[PDB]
Design a binder for this molecule. Structure first.
Ligand code: FES
Length: 85
């Protein structure tokens, strides 16, 4: 909402995936938003929520941002894919 939500990003923080210590790496992402007043590059590129993701996906790498579907999640991919976000 404050972050526009151009790319509604779906990030798994579910029970199974979360236990693998993904939280700290997604935390990187959290700060990777780094925002402005709304988002990253005052827009609202990010609209992160779990709810879509955690849907039977993990045997591929999934990262969704809106109708964009990227790879900026948790395990290091964040920083580089942040240039993408
Ligand atoms: S349950 Fe971890 S990826 Fe959609």
């Amino acid at each position: 909402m404050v972050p526009k939500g151009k790319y509604p990003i779906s990030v798994c923080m579910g029970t199974a995936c979360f236990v693998k210590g993904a939280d700290k790496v997604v935390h990187a992402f959290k700060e990777q938003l780094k925002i402005d007043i709304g988002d990253v590059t005052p827009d609202g590129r990010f609209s992160i929520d779990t709810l879509r993701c955690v849907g039977g996906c993990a045997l591929a790498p999934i990262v969704m941002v809106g109708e964009k579907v990227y790879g900026n999640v948790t395990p290091g991919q964040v920083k580089k894919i942040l240039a993408e976000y």
